[PDB]
Design a protein around this nucleic acid. Sequence first.
DNA 1: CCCTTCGGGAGGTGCATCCCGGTCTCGCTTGGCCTCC
DNA 2: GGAGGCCAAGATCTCAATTTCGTACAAGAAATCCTTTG
Lengths: 70, 342, 342
Amino acid sequence: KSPFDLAEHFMLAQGVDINGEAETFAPGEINAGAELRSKNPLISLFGRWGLSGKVGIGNAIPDGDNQWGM
Amino acid sequence: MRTLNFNGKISTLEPLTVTVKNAVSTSGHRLPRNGGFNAAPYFPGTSIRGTLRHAAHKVIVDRVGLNADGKSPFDLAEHFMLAQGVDINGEAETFAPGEINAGAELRSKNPLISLFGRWGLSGKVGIGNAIPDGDNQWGMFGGGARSIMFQRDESLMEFLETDQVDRLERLLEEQAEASVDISQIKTEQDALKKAMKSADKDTKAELQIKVRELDEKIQARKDQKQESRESIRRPIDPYEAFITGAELSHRMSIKNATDEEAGLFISALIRFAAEPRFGGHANHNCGLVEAHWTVTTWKPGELVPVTLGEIVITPNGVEITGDELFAMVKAFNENQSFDFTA
Amino acid sequence: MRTLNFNGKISTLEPLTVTVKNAVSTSGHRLPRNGGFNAAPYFPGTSIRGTLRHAAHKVIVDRVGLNADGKSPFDLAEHFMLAQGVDINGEAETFAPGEINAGAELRSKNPLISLFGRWGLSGKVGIGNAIPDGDNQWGMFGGGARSIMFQRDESLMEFLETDQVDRLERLLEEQAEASVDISQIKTEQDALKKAMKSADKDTKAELQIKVRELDEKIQARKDQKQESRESIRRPIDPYEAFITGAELSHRMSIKNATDEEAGLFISALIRFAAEPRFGGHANHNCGLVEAHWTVTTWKPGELVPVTLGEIVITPNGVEITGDELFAMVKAFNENQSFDFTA
DNA sequence: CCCTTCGGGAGGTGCATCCCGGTCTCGCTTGGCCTCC
DNA sequence: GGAGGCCAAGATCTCAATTTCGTACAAGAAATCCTTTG
C-alpha cells in the first residue's frame, strides 16, 4: 500500500480536494504556492483548483488528411 | 515620434480561448462574439494587451536588474502601476485636466507607462482585437469528463489500505445519492425556469426567489457530504476556442512612438515570444500562437505609409527585419534615462 | 465657391466606440441609439467633427511651422480659436447677426475657421453621423477583468521582497474585507431601492436620504483601506462598439467653399489617415477606420450630383482620385497668405 | 448466353464545481495662498 | 508689491433599467465535341 491518503491520491492525479478545502484567492496562500510547488513537484506540474498548472498539454492534430475513420 | 502600426496575423498553434464574464453565461462558455450571439468570435484586444503589458513589465524588471537574491528594486506599487496601471499608494501623480504636455516628463522617464498608459495618462499603445479569418475557425474545445481514478484503473487500488477502500466506498455512495437528490431538485428548478418565460413578471420575481432558494437547498445538500463536497465524476463543460491553425488578423498601433518606447514594445514582443500564450485553459496548452506583424510608420501629411520592418514570432525563433526595428530596440536597450520608481 | 458632398462608407478596422453621457447609464455603456435599447446606434457626428477639426488644426500647425525658438506661434487664445472656436480673450470680430455672408476677410485669411466655424461664424463643414448599414453591427466589446498580477503568474512573486510580499497579502486581505462589506451595503441599498417602488412621498423622502448615506458609508469604508482605495481584482464593464468591419454610411459636406478651404479639408483628411482613429478606448486600438468617400458637387443651376473624385483612406495609404481634388489640395498648399494669428 | 440469396439485431450507466470583484470625473466662480516678475 | 497660477470651498438632488439575416435557382450554341465509325 502507498503512504498517501486517498484524498492525496485524488489531489495528485485528478486535482480534486475531497477533504473539502482549497480556495483560490486565499490571501495567506499568495506565497504558499511557491513552497507548495517546491515540495510537491507533481502538483506544481499538474495544477489544482486554485493553483495554476505549470504543464500544459496541447491537442494532437493529424498532419495529413484522411488519417481517421470508423 | 513616429506612429507605428503593427498589422499582421496571429496563427494558432494550440487552441486560443478566453473566458470573458460578459460573453459567458449559464448557457455555457462562449468566446466573445463580435456583434451578436450568432456573430464571429474574436479574441479580445484586452487579453492581448494584458499579456503584452505583463511581458513588457517583465522586460523592464529584467532590464533594471534583479538584486543578488533575484528581487527587483521595484516595490509592489511600482509593479502594479507598471503592469496594470493601478496605483495602490494613491501617490501616483494625477495630471489635472488642462496640463500642457501632461506627463511628458513621466513618459520620457517611464517608457512603459507611456506605452501602456495609466489612469489619467493616455497609453500610446492600442492593442486591437484579433478577428478570425474564414467562416469556421472556432469550436467547443476542452470538454470530456473527470473520472474516478480507481474505477478506471484497478491497479491503483493496490496502493490503498482497507480504511481508504472503505472511504472510497463511502465517497461513491455519497456522490450517487447526493447526485440523485441534486438532479431531482435541479429538475424542479428546470421546470420552474421553463415556466420563467410567463408574461406575469410580478410573479417572475417570486419565481426568481424560488430559484434562489432552490439553489440554496442544492448548496445545503452538497454541504451535507462528509467525503466529497463536489461530485468527483462529472462531465467537463467544453470551452469555445479558436481552432488550431486559425489565422486571426490583428492590428496594434503606437501613436507618436518615440524610438525608446517603440524599442521597449519590440522587446516586450520578443520576451512574449518565449511564452507566446494568449488566454486561458493553459492546462491544455491553449494560448500558444505564432504571430507575424508588419510595422508600418505613417508620417502625417504623407499619402502612403512606409514599412519599417516585420516582426515574426514562431516556435523556431523571433525574426525581426528592417534596420529600423533593430535601431529602435538598440536605442531602448542603450538609453539609461528611465526611472520607473515614483 | 462649390459645395463638396463627401458621401461614403467607413469600414471599421477595429471596434468603434464612444462615451456619451446621455447614452451611458448605470446599466452600462451604450452607444447613442436615438431611441430605446432595441434601436440602431449611430456614431456621433460631433466626435468625427472634433477629430477632423483636430486633424485640420494639426495640419495648420504643420503648415505654419514653429518659431525660430522652436515654439508654436499660436498662443492660448489663437489655439482655442482654431481648436474649439472659444474666444477666451474676448477679442473677435463680432459679425452682424443678420448678415449671413460675414467674415469673408476672416474666411479667406483663416481657412480653418472657415471650414469649421468659430463662435458667431457659421462653419462651412457639416460632418454627419456614421450610420451602420446593418441590423446587427454593434456589440459589447472590451470588458474582461483586471487580474492581480501575482495571482496569475506565480513567477512574478520571485521579484517581490518579503516586505512587499506581506504588503501584497495585506492588500488582498483589505480587498477581501472591503468587498464583503461593500457588497452587504449595496444589498441594503438594493433592498431600499426595492422599497422605493412601493413608497409614498413621506417614506420616499425618508428612504432616499438613507441611500445616499449608505453611499457615503461605502466611500468611507473604501477610504479605510490602508493599502488600496479601489479593489484591483475588478471586472471591467464592457463598452458598446461597432463590430470590426462595420460598413457605416457617412455623409459629410463642405458648403460654398473656396478651393483653398476644400484643400485644407482634404489635407486634414490625409493627416487623419496617419492615425485614422475615431472615438475612445484607444487602449484596445478602438477607432481605427478605413473610409472611401465619393466627393460629389452640384451642377451649376441643375440639381444633379457630379462626381468630382474619391477619397479612399486605408491602412495601405490615402488614394485621392480626381484631378479637381489634387487642384484643391495644391491650392491650399499655395495661397501662403493665410493668417491664423488674428 | 445465364443470373446477383435469405436476416439478425441496433445497450445498459455515470455525473454536470467551487469564486472573485464592478474605479476615479467633470464640465463654475471666487478668494487665499505661493511664488514670479 | 502687484500680478499670474493652484488649490479648496461653496445648497442639496436627480431616476430609466434592454433577448441571436437568406434555403436551392439554372437555355440554345462553336462547339472542341469528336469522334465515332474504321
